Enzyme design. Structure first.
Site, short mmCIF file in Angstrom:
data_model
loop_
_atom_site.label_atom_id
_atom_site.label_comp_id
_atom_site.label_asym_id
_atom_site.label_seq_id
_atom_site.Cartn_x
_atom_site.Cartn_y
_atom_site.Cartn_z
N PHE A 92 95.57 16.08 -18.15
CA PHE A 92 95.52 15.24 -16.96
C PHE A 92 96.75 15.58 -16.14
CE2 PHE A 92 96.27 11.51 -14.35
CZ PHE A 92 95.00 11.36 -13.80
N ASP A 150 103.84 20.47 -17.59
CA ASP A 150 103.73 19.19 -16.90
C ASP A 150 104.43 18.17 -17.77
OD1 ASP A 150 103.05 16.77 -15.74
OD2 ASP A 150 100.93 17.28 -15.46
N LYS A 180 106.79 9.72 -12.90
CA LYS A 180 106.76 8.50 -13.69
C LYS A 180 108.14 7.90 -14.05
CE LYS A 180 102.02 8.45 -15.56
NZ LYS A 180 101.51 9.83 -15.36
C1 LIG Z 1 100.25 10.32 -15.06
C2 LIG Z 1 100.26 11.81 -14.98
C3 LIG Z 1 100.02 12.52 -13.74
C4 LIG Z 1 99.73 11.78 -12.45
O1 LIG Z 1 100.94 11.20 -11.96
P1 LIG Z 1 100.63 10.41 -10.58
O2 LIG Z 1 102.02 9.76 -10.09
O3 LIG Z 1 99.55 9.24 -10.86
O4 LIG Z 1 100.12 11.31 -9.53
C5 LIG Z 1 100.07 13.92 -13.76
N1 LIG Z 1 100.33 14.59 -14.91
C6 LIG Z 1 100.55 13.97 -16.08
C7 LIG Z 1 100.82 14.79 -17.32
C8 LIG Z 1 100.52 12.56 -16.17
O5 LIG Z 1 100.74 11.93 -17.35
#
Ligand SMILES: *Cc1c(COP(=O)(O)O)cnc(C)c1O
Ligand SMILES: *Cc1c(COP(=O)(O)O)cnc(C)c1O
Lengths: 375, 375
Positions: free
Chosen positions: A127, A212, A241
């Protein structure tokens, strides 16, 4: 309701929080083990962060990147000082915007060399975001449903299956995008062996390694950057985050030689790197660095206690943990809520725990207590 | 430096703002006629905004859309109240995330209806964002270079050229994306005649009308939404920048029928709709609607004075104005800066003015004087 129906919200509304607790209008207390999905790294109303933000709000909220943003340099310095090599930072506003920047940087990097490498290999159950670039990298077709066509060039290999990666790799591959631990996907851990091989491939096949760390970053797993658990050497990493402790912020950090491709006018953001977010980020980074030994200690403790429950496989590390149940976990989330505990259910039957990094063993025992009562 | 080189920053370091003035590290004072690119709608240190944010920071910064966010309901209600029909809102963190949400909603909309419409027609000189979806809608190839392939299905027509639209519209067209006034592109105005026909085309060809109001929205042009100047009836609009008065925020507002397509799990944002952004938006929306008459009056005053200089073609509406010079406006930005005035140069020869919406005639005169002396 005047809001679109894209979320599946729990029947609870908070008005205030303090420490690792949240409170609804009724005044009912809730032990937070989700931290807004790993965003409230320092819990709620953290004194140092609160005072800093109150001061910044009265001083300057935004000026845009038309001008020099000194606060960006300061935060960037702290992020780069923890990187494995010399690097540079570009600030965004969210994780998805950060992954987007990484994809654009990776493609332009090769184009600058006159090479036509534009493809990316990401993984199933990953994700990376909801915007088109990030969505294309996200290896979950259910989230693609209805938005096609996506950005061309993305294929999905399987975590801890190096052979699935070799199969999708060709001379047109720009990079490999991966999460050291897949959060939303069920707290799936990439093994040291797999990650070590993935790194070797990138060096061997001349492909960029993009990690990521939007969810694993900033101390969440017991190290400042989760890639440090395996001495990895990523070309680019995405962050967001927990970096802002609650304030919206995102960023990509790339090694010098790669960062060079982000030339004047090649990319940008209006809100990116504003003084409020950077003020928050500076506080968080300094605080997490001091808390790391505690995160490791409390995390190990929490993982041990989860195993003691004998209710499923325990996954993850540091404070990014999961409990894989035999049944769907959706109902357990509600039962925990009634008992004043906030937990999350992802991947159908995996309870995801993401408590604030300031969590203590006493709070852990309180949470474990509730789990023992409901599982 | 620790930052990537993707920006062409002016050599000025701001540290604090008060009203419509900014102060750099040397304490020098600047009259702000750029407002961070139309973001600081209420200027800096606006009392009502500051007090509301400080109060919010002490209570709650972020909980995520896992739970109910009542503050989202309140702000959405205020935004829908000014919309031409019943609608719903989805909260994002930036203008680009907003356009991305609109593109996704439009595509899924037609998919839910069993139809195969996935293409979009946008315009040359348009600017909708840097993330892939928005980048594809942005009709400026220079921003695409090195990032291709983009999202498939986007073609660019010419503003005020209705025939260029027909040559690109087919039965697979999902929608048309446009800025009532293209800011970044040189403050280009879509004619009333053109917008009328475009509205006609959408109703007759059965294509969604998506208006990007990230720059023109929230009072910037004299009306809450710029589309109201032409009594348009958009299916979806995108908002950001000025909506948060400095705090990052974005959103799309879509009439009821289209909004239906954003079903549970179809889209989302981690930071979207957090209580800090919504508290800011709530203050800005209430204050801005009270300022509309003022925006119109001071705006017309300013436009007339600009015409009086006799140094070029004056473009724009309300407080979104531009002065198209005979040559590059690069140097005038520096000269104005040296004289304590912040102005912007876009489209190479267009000076763009985006003062805070609280700007007064006395301030306008100050800026005009500087312009008279440098132009
Ligand atoms: C939560 C998450 C995202 C999305 O972050 P957003 O601020 O909602 O765009 C992208 N990559 C990873 C690995 C995540 O856990
Ligand atoms: C500024 C702008 C955008 C981009 O907004 P961001 O927050 O930088 O993503 C998109 N569309 C229009 C019309 C704009 O003026």
């Amino acid at each position: 309701t005047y809001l679109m129906n894209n979320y599946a919200r729990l029947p609870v509304k908070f008005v205030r929080g303090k420490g690792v607790y949240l409170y609804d209008e009724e005044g009912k207390e809730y032990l937070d083990f989700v931290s807004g999905i790993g965003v409230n790294s320092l819990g709620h109303a953290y004194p140092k962060l609160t005072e800093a933000l109150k001061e910044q709000v009265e001083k300057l909220l935004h000026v845009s990147n038309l001008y020099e943003n000194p606060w960006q340099e300061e935060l960037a310095h702290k992020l780069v000082k923890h990187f494995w090599t010399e690097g540079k930072v570009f600030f965004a506003n969210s994780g998805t915007e950060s992954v987007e920047a990484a994809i654009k940087l990776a493609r332009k990097y090769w184009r600058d060399k006159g090479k036509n490498k534009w493809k990316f290999i990401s993984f199933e159950n990953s994700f990376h975001g909801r915007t088109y670039g990030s969505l294309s990298a996200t290896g979950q077709p259910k989230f693609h449903k209805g938005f096609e066509p996506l950005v061309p060039g993305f294929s999905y290999a399987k975590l801890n299956d190096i052979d699935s990666v070799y199969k999708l790799l060709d001379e047109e591959t720009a990079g490999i995008i991966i999460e050291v631990i897949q959060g939303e996907g069920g707290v799936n851990e990439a093994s040291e062996d797999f990650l070590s091989k993935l790194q070797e491939i990138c060096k061997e096949k001349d492909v960029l390694l993009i990690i990521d760390e939007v969810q694993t970053g900033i101390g969440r797993t017991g190290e400042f950057y989760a890639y440090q658990h395996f001495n990895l050497k990523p070309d680019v990493i995405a962050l967001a985050k927990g970096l802002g402790g609650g304030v919206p912020i995102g960023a990509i950090l790339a090694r010098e030689e790669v960062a060079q491709s982000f030339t004047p006018g090649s990319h940008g953001s209006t809100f990116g790197g504003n003084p409020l977010a950077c003020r928050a980020g500076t506080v968080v980074v300094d605080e997490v660095e001091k808390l790391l030994p505690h995160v490791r200690e409390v995390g190990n403790y929490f993982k041990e206690k989860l195993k003691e429950l004998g209710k499923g496989k325990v996954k993850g590390r540091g404070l990014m943990l999961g409990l894989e149940l035999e049944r769907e976990c959706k109902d357990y989330v509600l039962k925990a809520l009634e008992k004043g505990l906030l937990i999350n259910c992802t991947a159908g039957k995996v309870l995801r725990f993401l408590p604030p990094l300031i969590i203590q063993k006493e709070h852990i025992d309180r949470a474990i207590s509730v789990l023992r009562e409901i599982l």
